[PDB]
């Protein structure tokens, strides 16, 4: 699938540091340690199970406002 | 806490101007200059001491029909 573009859904960012001034954002929060992290695919990219990112590839070091701590 | 969406309570808008249609609205009126404002908790977002806004965060440039001027 095509790689996700900043702002895709929920304020998505390919560079979590970029989500900085977001009230919900916390240091340490990445698509990688997210409860929506499907599996890795190619060169930092992976799949997000959250229904909203079903047709794009997302980035390991990225972030979105729908972020939940992995269990 | 979570950010407050538009219409949360008392005609709430995260962007003051949007309320230009309210009888109680006046240019220059903002959460940050409101008596119920409990200051920025996060960057551009603060607390509201009004019980109807107690679970959420409100926005410095927002406005609610229960606005009260402050010093
Ligand atoms: S839900 Fe989690 S994994 Fe999916 S894009 Fe947002 S932060 Fe990344
Ligand atoms: S009462 Fe309304 S205008 Fe005043 S701070 Fe709370 S949300 Fe903003």
UniProtKB/Swiss-Prot annotation, chains A, B:
Composition-biased stretches (Basic and acidic residues): 1-13
PROSITE patterns: HIPIP
Binding site for [4Fe-4S] cluster: 31, 34, 48, 64
Database matches in Pfam families: HIPIP
GO molecular function: 4 iron, 4 sulfur cluster binding; electron transfer activity; metal ion binding
Entry keywords, A to Z: 4Fe-4S, Electron transport, Iron, Iron-sulfur, Metal-binding, Transport
Role noted for this protein: Specific class of high-redox-potential 4Fe-4S ferredoxins. Functions in anaerobic electron transport in most purple and in some other photosynthetic bacteria and in at least one genus (Paracoccus) of halophilic, denitrifying bacteria.
Record's protein name: High-potential iron-sulfur protein isozyme 1
Organism: Halorhodospira halophila
Name of encoding gene: hip1
């Amino acid at each position: 699938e095509p790689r996700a573009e900043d702002g895709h859904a929920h304020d998505y960012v390919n560079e979590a540091a970029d989500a900085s001034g977001h009230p919900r954002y916390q240091e340490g929060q990445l698509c990688e340690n997210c409860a929506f992290w499907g599996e890795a695919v190619q060169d930092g990219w992976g799949r997000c199970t959250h229904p909203d990112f079903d047709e794009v590839l997302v980035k390991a070091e990225g972030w979105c406002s729908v972020y939940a701590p992995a269990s």
